[PDB]
Amino acid sequence: NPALRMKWMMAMKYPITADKRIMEMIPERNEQGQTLWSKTNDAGSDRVMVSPLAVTWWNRNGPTTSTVHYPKVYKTYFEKVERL
Amino acid sequence: NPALRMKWMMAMKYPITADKRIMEMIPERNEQGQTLWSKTNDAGSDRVMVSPLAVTWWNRNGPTTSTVHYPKVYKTYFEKVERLKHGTFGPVHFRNQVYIEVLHLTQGTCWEQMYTPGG
Amino acid sequence: YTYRCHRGDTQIQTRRAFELKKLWEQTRSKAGLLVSDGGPNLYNIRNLHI
Amino acid sequence: SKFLLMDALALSIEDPSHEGEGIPLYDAIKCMKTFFGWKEPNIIKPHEKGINPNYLLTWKQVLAELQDIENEEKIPRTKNMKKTSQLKWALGENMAP
Amino acid sequence: SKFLLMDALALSIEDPSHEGEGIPLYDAIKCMKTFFGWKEPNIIKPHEKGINPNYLLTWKQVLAELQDIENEEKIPRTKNMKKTSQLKWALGENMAP
RNA sequence: CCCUG
RNA sequence: AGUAGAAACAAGGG
RNA sequence: CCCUG
RNA sequence: AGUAGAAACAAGGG
C-alpha cells in the first residue's frame, strides 16, 4: 500500500530527491538551525537528498518572477472559474 | 566541604553500605519494580551497597519488636519533654536587662518571659 | 531537598516518593512520623533542645 | 475483541505542550507516575489452558523494565523486551513444526 | 555581574507535573520551542578588545547542537559541545605560558 | 598510554 | 580575550 | 555469517 | 498456548 509507505517515508529526515545546484540557492541551515539538505548523494545517480523543509524555505524565501503565461496556457481551467 | 559531597553522594543509586544478611530480610525489588540493593561488594570488605529505599522499606515493612526499654534508658531526655509539656507560661515583660535548661527561651536581649516548670 | 524526604501529602515526584506515600498512608497518627520519613515539622523555639 | 470496551479504565494526564506526534513511551511513564496504589499482584481468575506464572512473571518483567529506564546514560525512544523464557512461551516462539 | 539584573528577559512555560529535580536540558528545549520569531543574528554593539565573529559562531553552534539533539537514537541528559576553534578562543584555551 | 585536582 | 589586584589563574608530572 | 518479508 | 476456519500461520533457504 503506497499510502502507508509514504506515511513512513515522510517520517524520515530527507525523503525528497533534488538536483545539485540547490546547494547554491538555499542554505544548509535555517534561521533556527534546522538542516535542509545532506551531503550524501543519491544511489545510482548524482542527486542530493532534501527534506520537505527545503520546499517551504523556497516558497517563503526564493527568487520571484512575473507569471502572465500560466493562465494563457491553462485557459480552460481559468474559464471554468470565471464562469462560476 | 562535606555538605556538597553528601549532596552529590545522595544522588547516586546505592550510597549506603550494609551487611550481607540484608539480602535475606528485604527483597531486591519494590512493589513497583524499583531496585533496593545490588550484588556488587564494597571495596576492602564484604559489605554490599544499599539505597535509602531499603531504609524506607524496612521502616514500613519489617519485623516488629517491643520498645518498652527505650524510655527507661533515655530517662533524662523524656523527663525534659514531660516537664515542658506540663509547664505554664506567662506574660512578656519588655525591660532593661530546671530553669537554666530552658534559658534560651526565658531570657532575651531586652525581654523577659515568665516560666515555671511543671515539675 | 538534600535527603529527598519530602512530606507525605506533597505532590513532588522523586525516587522515594512511592515509599514515603505508602508509609504515610499506612500510619494512623501522621504527627508521629520523623521528618526523615515524610512527617510534619514540630520544632519551635521552645523545642530546640529536645 | 482485541481490546476491552466496557471494562476499560485509563490513567489520565494533561499535556499543554501540544506536540503533533511525540514519543509514546514518555507518555506511558508519565501516566504511570500519577498512581501510588501498586501492590503485589496475584492470580484470582486463572486461564485454564495456559501456564499462569508465565503471565505473572511477564507483568513483573514489564514493571521492572520500565524502572530500568532511569539508570541509563541516554533515555531511549522505544523499549525492547528481553527474550526471556516466559516471553518465549507466551508469544509462541519455536512452535511451528 | 555574572548575569543581567534589570535587562533580563525570560521565556516561560508551565509544568503541572511537579518534578522534584528533573533534567534541565529538556526544560530548556521546551521553553525554546515556544518562540516563533527567530531571525538571522548580527552584531550591533561590538566588543572592542575581542574577535567579534567568534561570538556569533558560538551562538549559531549552540543552535545547531540543539537541533542535532533531535537526530539521535537516544535522548541524552547533558550536551558536551564540540571543541571548535571559536570555543577554543572564547574559553581561553592554550593561553598559559 | 598512566597518575594527580 | 577574560577573572583578578601589590600576585596569581588562564592545567602539572612522568 | 549472508540474502529474502 | 493463540489466531482462524473445510486450510493455513505459529519463519524459510543457502
UniProtKB/TrEMBL annotation, chain B:
It is found in: Host mitochondrion; Virion; Host nucleus. Residues 1-63 form the Influenza RNA polymerase PB2 second domain. It comes from the Viruses. Belongs to the influenza viruses PB2 family. Influenza RNA polymerase is composed of three subunits: PB1, PB2 and PA. Interacts (via N-terminus) with PB1 (via C-terminus). Interacts with nucleoprotein NP (via N-terminus). Plays an essential role in transcription initiation and cap-stealing mechanism, in which cellular capped pre-mRNAs are used to generate primers for viral transcription. Recognizes and binds the 7-methylguanosine-containing cap of the target pre-RNA which is subsequently cleaved after 10-13 nucleotides by the viral protein PA. Plays a role in the initiation of the viral genome replication and modulates the activity of the ribonucleoprotein (RNP) complex. This is Polymerase basic protein 2. It comes from Influenza A virus (A/Zhejiang/DTID-ZJU01/2013(H7N9)). The gene is PB2.
From TrEMBL, chain C:
Coiled coil: none annotated. Phosphorylated by host PRKCA. It is found in: Host nucleus; Host cytoplasm. Belongs to the influenza viruses polymerase PB1 family. RNA-dependent RNA polymerase which is responsible for replication and transcription of virus RNA segments. The transcription of viral mRNAs occurs by a unique mechanism called cap-snatching. 5' methylated caps of cellular mRNAs are cleaved after 10-13 nucleotides by PA. In turn, these short capped RNAs are used as primers by PB1 for transcription of viral mRNAs. During virus replication, PB1 initiates RNA synthesis and copy vRNA into complementary RNA (cRNA) which in turn serves as a template for the production of more vRNAs. RNA-dependent RNA polymerase which is responsible for replication and transcription of virus RNA segments. The transcription of viral mRNAs occurs by a unique mechanism called cap-snatching. 5' methylated caps of cellular mRNAs are cleaved after 10-13 nucleotides by PA. In turn, these short capped RNAs are used as primers by PB1 for transcription of viral mRNAs. During virus replication, PB1 initiates RNA synthesis and copies vRNA into complementary RNA (cRNA) which in turn serves as a template for the production of more vRNAs. Influenza RNA polymerase is composed of three subunits: PB1, PB2 and PA. Interacts (via N-terminus) with PA (via C-terminus). Interacts (via C-terminus) with PB2 (via N-terminus); this interaction is essential for transcription initiation. This is RNA-directed RNA polymerase catalytic subunit. It comes from Influenza A virus.
UniProtKB/TrEMBL annotation, chains D, E:
Phosphorylated on serines and threonines by host kinases, including human casein kinase II. Signal peptide: none annotated. It is found in: Host cytoplasm; Host nucleus. Plays an essential role in viral RNA transcription and replication by forming the heterotrimeric polymerase complex together with PB1 and PB2 subunits. The complex transcribes viral mRNAs by using a unique mechanism called cap-snatching. It consists in the hijacking and cleavage of host capped pre-mRNAs. These short capped RNAs are then used as primers for viral mRNAs. The PB2 subunit is responsible for the binding of the 5' cap of cellular pre-mRNAs which are subsequently cleaved after 10-13 nucleotides by the PA subunit that carries the endonuclease activity. Belongs to the influenza viruses PA family. Influenza RNA polymerase is composed of three subunits: PB1, PB2 and PA. Interacts (via C-terminus) with PB1 (via N-terminus). This is Polymerase acidic protein. The chain holds residues 280 to 376 of 716 of the full protein.
